[PDB]
Every structure is written in C-alpha cells, then in structure tokens.
Design a protein around this ligand. Structure first.
Ligand SMILES: [Zn+2]
Length: 202
C-alpha cells in the first residue's frame, strides 16, 4: 500500500450472507481491493465457508457481536459474552482472532470499552443503506462523500447493497483509490504522519 496515493476503507457489517457477501468478495477480487467485514457470530456459525473465503482473499474481519443487541442495554457480563462468543466461533473456524470491534448501532459506554480489550472501529461515511435500500441512492451518497482516508459503512446483507458495492468498488478503483482494510488505513496514516519526524534533522 502506497501512502502517497489515495486510500479508502470499505467496511461491511451484519454478514456473512453468502448470496450478497460472496458477490462483494467477487467485486473486491476482480478490482484487486480489500475490505473489512464486521461479522455476526451467529452468522459465522451458519456460514463458516464465507469467513474462510474472506480471510483467504486478504480481507480483515472484525467483531460485530453474536446476535446484534444494543450492548449498552445488557449487563456487562451478557455484553462481554456477545463479544467473546463471537471471538470464539471465529477462532474455532479459522484460528483468527479479531482485534477490531464495531458495537451494534455504535452503542458503547466507558465500562465496556475497558473490559472488551478490543479496538473500537467507527466510520465517517454512512449512506444508511439499511434505510434507503436503493442501489443508485447508495452509490451516489457514497461517491459524493468518498475521499482519501475515509471509512465507509455498508451492510453486506441487502441485494441493493451488494449491487451498490460493486459499482462503488469499480468507481473508486477507476478514480485511483487503493481499497484497504481498517488496519491498513491506520498504518498508512502512521506512515504519512511520520514525515513530521523528519523535522528533527531538518
Ligand atoms: Zn449491524
């Protein structure tokens, strides 16, 4: 990943759902991009083959809870079990241990942050594809807000979202973006910040 070229992080929440997730994985592979999938533990259990595929093709996997409750409405014990059960099924299938968590609906408090022992991954472009389940609406919202260094929130459980994602992947690739994982984006930003280190010997 070249830090002097454009980068963007496509992130996909609520899968796996083979019919839609596999289409998005195909688009990423066709256009030589990667993304980050925040998966539900219950759906990983239903669709272990899709977890293996997204990892095999170089994508990053994050934790999106077991069954998608608002974690702040639960006891800490129940909420931590949501997260740890999802860590556990991912590890049992793949040997992979996510470091990134996206709490359902973004709901999180300080008590859970300190006990989760994971990095909370947010977003800054949200086309609300669960609300406007319309391919062109999603595409145009994302393409209008896309920019270097931004993180896009899509849900890979809707046909309109998978179709929109193919077009978004194509158009961003056509514009010269590198489609990177969340961790790759963080590393690029560190590489770019490091140019200020050179001030020490200027
Ligand atoms: Zn979700």
């Amino acid at each position: 990943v070249d830090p002097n070229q454009k980068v963007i992080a496509l992130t996909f929440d609520d899968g796996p759902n083979p019919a839609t997730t596999n289409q998005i994985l195909d688009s990423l592979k066709k256009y030589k991009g990667h993304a980050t999938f925040f998966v539900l533990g219950s759906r990983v259990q239903y669709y272990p083959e899709t977890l293996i595929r997204m990892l095999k093709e170089g994508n990053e996997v994050g934790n999106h809870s077991w069954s998608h409750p608002l974690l702040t409405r639960l006891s800490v014990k129940e909420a931590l079990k949501q997260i740890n059960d999802t860590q556990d099924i991912i590890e049992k299938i793949s040997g992979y241990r996510p470091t990134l968590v996206r709490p359902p609906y973004g709901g999180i408090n300080d008590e859970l942050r300190s006990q989760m022992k994971m990095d909370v991954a947010l977003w800054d472009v949200d086309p609300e594809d669960w609300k406007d389940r319309n391919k062109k609406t999603i595409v145009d919202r994302v393409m209008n807000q896309a920019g270097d260094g931004r993180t896009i929130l899509i849900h890979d459980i809707y046909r309109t979202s998978a179709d929109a994602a193919d077009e978004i992947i194509k158009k961003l690739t056509d514009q010269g973006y590198q489609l990177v994982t969340v961790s790759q984006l963080e590393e690029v930003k560190k590489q770019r910040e490091a140019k200020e280190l050179r001030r020490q010997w200027s």
